Amino acid sequence: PFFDVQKRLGLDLDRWMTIQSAEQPHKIPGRCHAFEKEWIECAHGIGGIRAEK
Amino acid sequence: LLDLIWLETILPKTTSFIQMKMSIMVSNQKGLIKLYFLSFLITIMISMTLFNYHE
Amino acid sequence: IARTFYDGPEKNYEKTMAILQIEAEKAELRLKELEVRRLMRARGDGPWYQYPTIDKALIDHSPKTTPDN
Amino acid sequence: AKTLLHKYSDIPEGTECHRKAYASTSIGGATGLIVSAYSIALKPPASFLEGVARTGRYTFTSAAIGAIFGLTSCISAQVREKPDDPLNYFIGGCAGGLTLGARTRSYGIGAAACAYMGLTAALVKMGQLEGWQVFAEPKV
Amino acid sequence: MNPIIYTTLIMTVMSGTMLVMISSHWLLIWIGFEMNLLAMIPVLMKNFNPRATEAATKYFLTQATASMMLMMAIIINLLYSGQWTITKMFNPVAMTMMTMALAMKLGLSPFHFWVPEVTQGISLQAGLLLLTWQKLAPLSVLCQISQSINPNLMLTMAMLSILIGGWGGLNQTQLRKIMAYSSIAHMGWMTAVLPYNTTMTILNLLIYITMTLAMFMLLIHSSATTTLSLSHTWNKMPVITSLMMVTLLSMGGLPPLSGFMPKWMIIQEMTKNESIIMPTLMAMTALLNLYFYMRLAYSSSLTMFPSTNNMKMKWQFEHTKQMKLLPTMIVLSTLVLPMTPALSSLN
Amino acid sequence: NVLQIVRDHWVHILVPVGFVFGCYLDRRSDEKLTAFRNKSLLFKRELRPNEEVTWK
Amino acid sequence: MLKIIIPTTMLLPMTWMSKHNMIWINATVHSLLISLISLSLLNQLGENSLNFSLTFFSDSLSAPLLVLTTWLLPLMLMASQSHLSKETTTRKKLYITMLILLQLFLIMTFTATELILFYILFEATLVPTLIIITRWGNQTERLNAGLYFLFYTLAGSLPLLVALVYIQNTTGSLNFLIIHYWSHPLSNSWSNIFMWLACIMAFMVKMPLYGLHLWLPKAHVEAPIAGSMVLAAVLLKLGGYGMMRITTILNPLTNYMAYPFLMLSMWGMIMTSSICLRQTDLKSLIAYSSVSHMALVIVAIMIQTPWSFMGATALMIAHGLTSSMLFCLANTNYERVHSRTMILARGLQTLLPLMATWWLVASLTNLALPPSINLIGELFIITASFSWSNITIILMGMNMMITALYSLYMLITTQRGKYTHHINNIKPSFTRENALMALHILPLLLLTLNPKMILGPLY
Amino acid sequence: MTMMSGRPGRVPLQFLPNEARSLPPPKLTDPRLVYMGFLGYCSGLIDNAIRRRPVVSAGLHRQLLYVTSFVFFGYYLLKRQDYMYALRDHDMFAYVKSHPEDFPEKDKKTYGEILEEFHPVR
Amino acid sequence: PTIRLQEDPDPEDENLYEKNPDSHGYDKDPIVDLWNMRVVFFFGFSIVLVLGSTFVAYLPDYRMQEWARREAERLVKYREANGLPLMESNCFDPNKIQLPEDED
């Protein structure tokens, strides 16, 4: 299935465009930059099942 | 009456007849996309309400 | 016949003891693994069933052309 | 959708036979409508009147089977004073099966439908009693 | 078609599948599907013969419809959460749309109608590619989003695919339609265990792929696309029919053959999740596949059909081009059950 | 002349040696189930002053 | 236990590296030597089994079955080399390979410690049997027979698999020693009722039980001689062995779930025994006598007593030998007149005097003449059934009366009376056929002097 | 669901992590390796059969390559499988250790104190 | 041609006695047939039937029947002299059994 060659090679083919809090041109922020940043930080590394709750 | 007729009739002959009928019903599609794309529409609509409208 | 083709009852007896020990331990391990899988899947607090979330190192912590992010 | 199933399931078994029969009739009518839709899509009926006639035939057959099954199963569960017994569902199963045989006008289909619908209904009752899961939520 | 053009179209098909397989962004997965379809259409038309044009048109319409529903599901998911990463699909309407689009792409029932027609209308090499390589991308997507998949819908389509493949195969004299219905049944087996264990899905896919490759290569070796044409092969190459019979028995799922391993491994898994009725129905339904495999085995290898006089001339010539991976594929599709525990290397 | 016999009769030693090999593979198996050798409550016994194992 | 398996596996390369005119000699000699080696497993203990390793074990129930299985291969090779004369070399080797694979699967099936491995081998025995029937059978019905053989068995055993992997998920193991020691009662619930049915119906179809015995009169009749010999002698006993093994988990549920099967067996005994009275096909008569005999084994296993288990073991072994001999005896006449009609060739005692003696002895063992082990097993089962219920003596008694009737009828039709005038190609018996009969009958009589060797683990 | 697909610290396409070097390698006489070699030998025989060459003695270099390739792949396959099962055991033991209230140690009665129902056979 | 194909006629069966009047019915080749007979007879009747039967007859008493008879004689002698009952109704001692609390 998912073969994570981007993580293995550190290539970043499409991860720059996945979230709206990731390095926009001219530092233009998304409408919900703080909310998505907080949600991402809170759920980082705890797994999908834990994060949902 | 029993060995050659009714014991045949209940287990193997009934099974063969049912599978043959179902095979004929399943495989007798004329190959016109107008029919089974309409079938696809019916399927999509059912999925949205029957399995989607109660999650 | 007994001397040429067979062994004493102790060999078979203690081989049975060893075989039974191995099999009982394997059965206990199988049940324990099933229980661990159930708990881990529901809780998400174990190494197994870890579903990926967004990597935190993707966030840009730079001034954002507007004070309120 | 799901509402039609719970409408039948919320009524206790050997009680209020009219409402149980109405719920089973609604479930049967929905099943017949689905069958009619697929049959019309995959086998066009050559005119609108024939399509309406085929749809009405299938839906009435299915609704009649459901009504007879629900009525006889509730009545049997109420006169025998034994709810939670699969034999009531078996009796309802051949009630519906004999109805199907009458609708298609053939004895062999009727007897086969007795046997198979009664067995299936008794199995469904057993699954309700013992908690058998058709679709099982993943747990391990 | 030019050999270089054929080679680059094959590389584009494989590149689209790999793009789907290595992407974390939904848009790239969609692009991979589009790129796969674009290069896939001319491969199906390599020999013109208007039946190929019909098969290509039907395939294009089905896959384009599936792609549109897939894109709509992606956009709904984005609307309800500003997320592009392939994950557990925060919206349930989007999840239903995505599951239906992927089921259309794979050909699961009731989106199964196109598989027999397209397979019959194309050549045997095109059929080999269509029934082996084309399943990788949708199943790789389904493995990723399996946690959010609704079991009732997925299992309904799985049971329908098993039933419909088994029933449809019974009525077929053409070998490519038999292969298509076999493919539908095996897809149903793959997707039945997916919500419970994706390693079992991968294992079933690999075993099905090796068995399908062996069967298609054996049908290419003996240029037979009908039952009666295959019934002449005993009188020209008996070894090919013997290996075909063993491969058919394995595809049937009979122990101690390789075909048995996936079913054995899926049923067990479903019993650990308190699913008993579902595996019993699936195992009993697979007997239809076994029946129409046994009928082909009767036609080709276990009895001898009448032959023709001109076959004598064919006795004087050898098969020129050899398929190097055919022996390995046959052995892998038959004699691999004793190495079942190695499946732990798939997780 | 030995080849005139051997080259068409060597298939006559496949099953004999296959038997011998089989016996060997049994003995090695017995060497993996010795966790209770001279340890059972029914046959536990003091070793003779020269013997090393109660059974092989 | 590999000292039997590995020599059996070496029969394949030995057969494939043999001369075109030496395959039968090599295969016969080395299968006989494997039988000689297999005789060592009869040295059984009184308390537990012979636990060779984690995978294979031998008990007093599986040892006689193993000995019969290994002994049957030389007889099958002797019986097969006549009608396969005009066959090509590679197809002769393929037939012998089918027989060797069948023996290998059966040997591992009877000694597997774990029930899933037992299931896999017990299902693998289907492939060589089906290939034998549908490739080397003589008539056009052999195809249909094959299908009947294939799908009756599988439709029974597919639920069994689902039950077995279910059991391991709740008890933790499928090892038979662990299953026996850690046994627990079966509660009285619908789920347990269906688990009981899934564990039993697979074996019932193999016996077969009256009602699901249709596949047998087709498969045995249409099969070649070695196919019918192995089908009757060993493959039917797989169901008995599996039922005996799996009954431990079943209690106390078996007391009430056994009633329909006991009724089916005790009535189908009469039904099939009476069917034998009006049977125009001799091989079909022999086939139906097997259903009549296995009904008794089903009854003995269902009533669950030490006398019944001893009787069932003895009857399984005795029936294997007697039915194999009867099939061979019918094949001797078939290879002369090329028809299985019983009244076509008559008065054969006048023309073939010693084969008539063979016929008489086989018929005598079929009707369980004392003190043959056929009678020992039958009488033990009848005594246990009488303990289970006295009224059973009526059904049991009736079956005995009928069995003697169709046996001697079979003897009187084919051996006595006057020979049909037109037939003139009845050649004298060959030494191969006479020796094939003797190697069936002598072990049967010799087992009378040491019956404890075939009475199972309950002795 | 994927049980170990996202185990922390897992290298995406490694096939053989460094920690797997702590496990005893499979012996070269492993019966599973011998079965892989047997599979290679069968592949070589079938190769000779399809090409219409003398099955047993046609190409010894080709048959040797079949056997060698199968054994070579099987060795690493066995290493990965053994490592993956070792990981499963390690995680299961660690989780049982870290969740004592979910796997409580139960004092066990003897059969003299347990009351089992008796069901006579008659 | 009112035939549906070109086919060989069904050939008549061969009598092994025509060319080998002492044929043994094992093979067409007289020497191979005779050696098949000798090898079947020797390895079936002389080896497995006689030597195997002898081997089974003299198998050692691993079933412990004589042992059980000796033990039974010992206990019958001991119990009779003692005046104790010949056989005991309960196999397992009552002291080691912990019945549930009370009868109700």
Ligand SMILES: CCCCCCCCCCCCCCCCCC(=O)OC[C@H](COP(=O)([O-])OCC(O)COP(=O)([O-])OC[C@@H](COC(=O)CCCCCCCCCCCCCCCCC)OC(=O)CCCCCCCCCCCCCCCCC)OC(=O)CCCCCCCCCCCCCCCCC
């Ligand atoms: C190893 C194990 C051994 C077992 C294996 C072997 C045995 C098993 C298989 C054998 C039995 C299976 C057969 C079942 C029915 C098959 C019918 C059929 O094939 O239809 C195609 C066939 C073709 O139809 P068609 O070509 O389309 O139409 C042209 C007609 O042929 C021409 O039209 P027609 O004018 O000539 O005749 C039509 C008409 C005119 O009829 C006639 O002409 C003559 C009369 C026929 C029916 C007479 C029945 C009344 C008296 C019987 C009472 C019970 C028996 C005695 C008990 C004594 C107790 C000590 O018939 C009727 O109107 C009868 C309607 C229904 C009345 C009978 C149903 C009563 C159910 C019994 C309840 C039992 C509950 C438990 C009781 C516990 C205590 C015992 O239809 C027939 O011709 C046969 C119809 C007669 C059916 C009733 C006879 C069976 C009675 C017992 C059934 C139970 C067996 C199944 C058990 C599981 C089911 C829940």
Ligand SMILES: CCCCCCCCCCCCCCCCCC(=O)OC[C@H](COP(=O)([O-])OCC(O)COP(=O)([O-])OC[C@@H](COC(=O)CCCCCCCCCCCCCCCCC)OC(=O)CCCCCCCCCCCCCCCCC)OC(=O)CCCCCCCCCCCCCCCCC
């Ligand atoms: C979980 C772990 C396990 C995972 C499992 C994964 C899945 C396993 C396999 C799944 C199923 C595979 C099914 C394959 C179907 C293939 C269909 C086919 O070729 O026809 C059958 C073919 C029929 O032959 P035939 O009909 O007798 O021949 C007549 C000709 O067709 C008559 O035609 P002709 O006269 O035109 O002849 C031309 C001929 C002669 O050839 C030549 O003359 C060569 C000419 C050179 C021209 C150079 C042009 C260069 C310019 C184009 C550049 C394109 C760039 C595209 C990329 C764009 C990126 C944006 O060329 C060909 O026949 C086909 C050439 C094939 C080229 C392959 C291209 C590979 C692309 C790779 C894509 C991925 C790249 C990375 C992407 C990253 C993401 C972006 O025979 C077979 O292939 C038998 C089956 C072979 C299957 C192999 C077994 C499976 C693999 C085993 C090896 C190990 C695999 C695992 C590797 C693990 C990783 C290391």
Ligand SMILES: CCCCCCCCCCCCCCCCC[C@@H](O)O[C@H](CO[C@H](O)CCCCCCCCCCCCCCC)COP(=O)(O)OCC[N+](C)(C)C
């Ligand atoms: C021809 C060869 C075929 C093979 C033969 C196989 C025979 C299988 C028969 C199975 C034996 C018994 C099954 C279940 C036990 C009792 C069944 C029922 O008749 O008894 C009553 C069952 O009650 C009701 O009758 C429910 C059953 C009625 C619905 C089932 C339909 C049976 C009709 C016969 C179908 C034919 C069987 C073969 C199909 C091909 C008992 O009363 P009750 O106290 O309440 O229930 C106690 C059981 N508990 C403990 C699990 C709760």
Ligand SMILES: CCCCCCCCCCCCCCCCC[C@@H](O)O[C@H](CO[C@H](O)CCCCCCCCCCCCCCC)COP(=O)(O)OCC[N+](C)(C)C
């Ligand atoms: C006094 C006269 C009457 C006595 C008659 C007694 C007859 C007894 C012998 C007859 C045959 C015996 C049956 C064979 C069973 C043996 C199989 C196996 O169990 O034995 C193996 C022993 O292997 C032996 O090699 C037995 C092989 C004997 C094979 C007999 C074949 C004879 C046929 C000769 C054919 C003629 C040649 C051709 C002429 C034309 C066991 O392995 P092993 O590890 O040791 O034993 C462990 C116990 N230890 C530790 C004490 C050693």
Ligand SMILES: CCCCCCCC/C=C\CCCCCCCC(=O)O[C@H](COC(=O)CCCCCCC/C=C/CCCCCCCC)COP(=O)(O)OCCN
């Ligand atoms: C040649 C013909 C032979 C026919 C043999 C077929 C009959 C086999 C018997 C039934 C097979 C399915 C049984 C399933 C395996 C049992 C495992 C089990 O114990 O699961 C049960 C569940 O049992 C079932 O679901 C079985 C219901 C039936 C499903 C399929 C219907 C098949 C037809 C039933 C009647 C036919 C059986 C007798 C026919 C005899 C042959 C004619 C309980 O598990 P839990 O859900 O966890 O319950 C405890 C916690 N809640």
